[PDB]
Structure 1
Amino acid sequence: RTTSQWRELDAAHHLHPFTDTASLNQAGARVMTRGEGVYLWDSEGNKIIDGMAGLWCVNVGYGRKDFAEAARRQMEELPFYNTFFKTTHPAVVELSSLLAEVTPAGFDRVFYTNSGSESVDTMIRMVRRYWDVQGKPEKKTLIGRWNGYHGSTIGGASLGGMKYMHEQGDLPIPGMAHIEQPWWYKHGKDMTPDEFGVVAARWLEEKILEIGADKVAAFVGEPIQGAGGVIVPPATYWPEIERICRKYDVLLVADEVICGFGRTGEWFGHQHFGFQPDLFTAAKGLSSGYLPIGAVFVGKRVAEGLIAGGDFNHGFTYSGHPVCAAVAHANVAALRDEGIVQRVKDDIGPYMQKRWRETFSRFEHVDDVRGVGMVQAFTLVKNKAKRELFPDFGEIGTLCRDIFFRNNLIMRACGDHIVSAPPLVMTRAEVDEMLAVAERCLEEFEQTLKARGLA
């Protein structure tokens, strides 16, 4: 089909996630047709650099014919069987075993889902069930943060701190609370980032004491906030969050849906920041987005509590789906065996971070240049010296993002933050290629900003 016709059929029959349906159907959808390595092509024939790896998830990049073969082979033998009827199958068994190999010690039990959002809902139910098993029925509140993102189920949307999501669904559901996010640029006042990390972590302590520790089940956080704009907390933050959770007997949960499977150069974001969660949620990079699968990695304390609780009345038809498991297995084994994660840690991550900071250092309206491993970002700001953001946060970021897309580069705006998370397998030449397009785009952005008299 042509561009115009695929656009016509999409506008007529498709409801997109997180989209203005009326305005999209007017402008027309951009039709992505094929991918190879770090590159995409659209229906018009534009070669595009995918500086977002699909949706933070295509970690091995596009073009894995071995993954298609793994999919074909498994679908031919057993395309589906359920894990509900005192039943299992070799693909789910073999994946579970492999995951145990690459996860830290103590994470041997895994619960499968189809998505990061289902993993979060599963985790919420696990956390609350755990406290019931302990005879503490009031210990049910989960604390997340403003501008955190934990998916799109009613449960995950409530635990998330996106107001725009809360306003649709009568959210949050009860037993949720939120603390401010560890965003130093906005909230740091005259503290050092490290002083600020302690302050921002102790917001959890003061929330717990406001609520009553006996009512708090868990604190949940993305090691680095992804959708909120790659907010990288100070080094002092996570160890203090962990101290506080242990002080008050509150479960500690990492949402690893973005940071997992090598994004920071460790296998998991929590390893980078050096905390030890009781559970963590995954998806995305688990299969590099090649098939839908998510998981909850359940540490020993909680797993023992759940196993002591008899039946766990939860799950999805497609939990442990054999074909998705086969592809995840192929993916995880590749991340290990081809040295992809190790390469982020030791080679391409430090290169990207260095180049990133070199690239964006000069611009008058770029600040808070940050990142680690293969996730990185900056913020477009009104005045650097005053740490002053643009009003209507998001307007300026959108203008910038539009310059990127027109220049065949995918980087995302989260408010006025610009973020990137390319395939981990990106080469040095491809990093420089990407950064070259980005830099030219920021030159144009700075020129347009002065021209608008938005100076």
Structure 2
Amino acid sequence: QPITRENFDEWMIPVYAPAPFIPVRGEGSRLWDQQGKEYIDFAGGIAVNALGHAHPELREALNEQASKFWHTGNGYTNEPVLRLAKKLIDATFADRVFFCNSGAEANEAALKLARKFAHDRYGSHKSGIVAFKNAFHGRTLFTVSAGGQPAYSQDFAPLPADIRHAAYNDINSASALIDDSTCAVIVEPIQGEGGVVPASNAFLQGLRELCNRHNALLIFDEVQTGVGRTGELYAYMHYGVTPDLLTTAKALGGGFPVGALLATEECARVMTVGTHGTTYGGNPLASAVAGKVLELINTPEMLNGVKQRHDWFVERLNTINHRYGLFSEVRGLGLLIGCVLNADYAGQAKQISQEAAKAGVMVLIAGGNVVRFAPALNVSEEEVTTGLDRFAAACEHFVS
């Protein structure tokens, strides 16, 4: 049977308003819809497709593991998860890992661990979580309660207790809510969804000192910011501040559902048998693919190529903006970039984005005031230039 966009509004729980067109296939940073229209993809499946669409090596790893076995569940380990655990361990501060299937799942694990850890070493009452206004951490009750966007949490109250929000990049705000009762401080190194806003180096370093003083675990939510996105493997390396726990997802599987929690030995020791779990996490399908992703992403060449591409993007966006007077700022790190709208245009991020799509380029928002770019890490100069060309046309169309 034949499928059309109107089918989405009769069949799907109305949680999203997706685009009027329906993608059917893609290669690298180009995607095509059911009528053959071609888009340059700067959405990057919301910062996931780090190698672009239908990558041939990802496919080959996919179809090679798929012809062995896909899944047993965690009664049994497998070679792919173990290899991926090693890669991740060797490449980061981590001594151990847990695999799950989403960014939120990864965050659930991390907040669960810090909680058990605090209880087990200090007592039932050291249960506080500090997070940040505008943070986004997931849509599970706990993660969305840790998130600092109350419009996402209010309807599903009572919310789990002992969660407080401080102002991002505001060290005294944080200091005031962090004490001996705090078990965890969870933070994104760049707030993604809340408008591509990068932590300051003194802010992050400041939470690290606060966590030490109060015996609280510091947790980096790198589901958006990780696996190459900033030009280092993880943004913590860019800042030079090391967390107790790090969560990772999205790009980890370059399009396959996977997530993981990276922990130190000491922290890991806290989670004994049967204290957490997941049916699908650690499957060898996900693991063969993530493994090949890390193998391709975590190379001096690919990562420097991200620093290179950051400059191509910002430079052309600054030139677009000079011509059209749209934004007050282009900010971010690596290939997570925000264009902040000016006073004239504020709250119109989505309309620009819809224009973009009309002009054959896919971009994201990040709040109604930021247009956001999260392209593949291996976008070609040609793809960037022609996508920015069409962005430029959309900006013309929009500004009149």
Does the CA-based 8 Å contact 2:250-2:259 persist in structure 1? yes
How far apart, CA to CA, are the structure 2 residues paired with 1:341 and 1:301?
Answer: 30
1:373 corresponds to? 334
What residue in structure 1 maps to residue 356 of structure 2?
A: 404
Equivalent residues of 1:278, 1:301 under 8 A apart? no
Structure of higher CA gyration radius: 1
Greater mean alpha carbon deviation, residues 260-269 or residues 354-363: 354-363
Q: What is the CA RMSD across the aligned residues, in angstroms?
A: 2.1
User: Take 2:242 and 2:300, find their aligned partners in 1: how far apart are those partners?
Assistant: 27
Q: Distance in 2 between matches of 1:281 and 1:425?
A: 23
Stretch moving more, 431-440 or 257-266: 431-440
From 148, 156, 160, the equivalent of 2:135 is: 148
Give yes or no for contact 2:226–2:235 (8 Å, CA) kept in 1. yes
Q: Is 1:233 paired with 2:199?
A: yes
Q: Is the 8 A contact 1:353 1:371 kept in 2?
A: no
* Equivalent residue letter for 1:14: M
Q: Report the equivalent of 1:246.
A: 212
Task: Give the equivalent residue in structure 2 for 1:329.
Answer: 291
**1:105-124 correspondence runs (5 A):** 105=93, 107-124=94-111
1:286–1:332 contact (8 Å) kept in structure 2: yes
CA distance in 2, matches of 1:171, 1:227: 24
User: Which segments of structure 1 move beyond 4 Å, counting only runs of 4 or more?
Assistant: none
Alignment equivalent of 1:19, drawn from 9, 16, 24: 16
Residue 303 of structure 1 aligns to a residue whose secondary structure is helix
Q: 38, 45, 51: which is aligned to 1:47?
A: 38
Paired residues of 2:46 and 2:364 also in contact (CA < 8 A) = no
Partner of 2:160: helix, strand, or coil?
A: coil
C-alpha distance in structure 2 between counterparts of 1:115 and 1:89, whole Å = 20
The answer (yes or no) to whether the contact 1:370–1:376 under 8 Å persists in 2 is: yes
**2:314–2:330 CA contact under 8 A, matched in 1:** no
Partner in structure 2 of residue 204 of structure 1: 174
Aligned equivalent of 1:96: 85
Letter in 1 for 2:52: G
Q: Match for 2:4: what amino acid?
A: W
Secondary structure class of the residue paired with 1:314: coil
Letter aligned with residue 296 of structure 1:
L
Q: Percent identity?
A: 26
1:307-342 deviation digits (Å, cap 9, x = unpaired) = 5xx335211111101111111111111113583223
Count of residue correspondences: 399
Distance in 2 of aligned mates of 1:101 and 1:371: 27
Amino acid at match of 2:80: A
Q: Which amino acid aligns with 1:163?
A: P
- Say if 1:50 and 1:422, in contact at 8 Å, map to a contact too: yes
SS at match of 1:142: strand
Work out the CA distance in 1 between the residues paired with 2:297 and 2:158: 38
Distance 1:363 1:245 in 2: 45
TM superposition shift of 1:34: 0.3
Contact 1:365 1:382 in 2 (8 A): no
Q: Distance in 1 between matches of 2:158 and 2:304?
A: 40
CA distance in 1, matches of 2:336, 2:249: 17
Secondary structure in 2 aligned to 1:6? coil
1:171–1:52 CA distance, 2 compared to 1 (3 A): farther
Q: Could you say what secondary structure the match of 1:339 adopts? A: helix
User: What TM-score comes out, normalization by structure 1 length?
Assistant: 0.83
TM-score, L = length of structure 2:
0.93
Q: Distance in 1 between matches of 2:183 and 2:319?
A: 43
* Counterpart residue type for residue 355 of structure 2: I
C-alpha contact (below 8 Å) 2:245/2:262 kept by paired residues: yes
The unaligned stretches of length 5 or more in structure 2 are none
1:314 counterpart residue number: 276
Deviation at 1:67, TM superposition (A): 1.7
Shift of 1:232: 1.9
Q: Is the 8 A contact 2:185 2:217 kept in 1?
A: yes
Instruction: Verify the 8 A CA contact 2:100 2:278 in the aligned structure 1.
Output: yes
Q: Is the 8 A contact 1:365 1:380 kept in 2?
A: yes
Asked if structure 1 preserves the Cα contact closer than 8 Å seen for 2:114 and 2:183, the reply is yes
Deviation at 1:440, TM superposition (A): 2.4
Q: 2:71–2:284: 8 Å Cα contact kept in structure 1?
A: yes
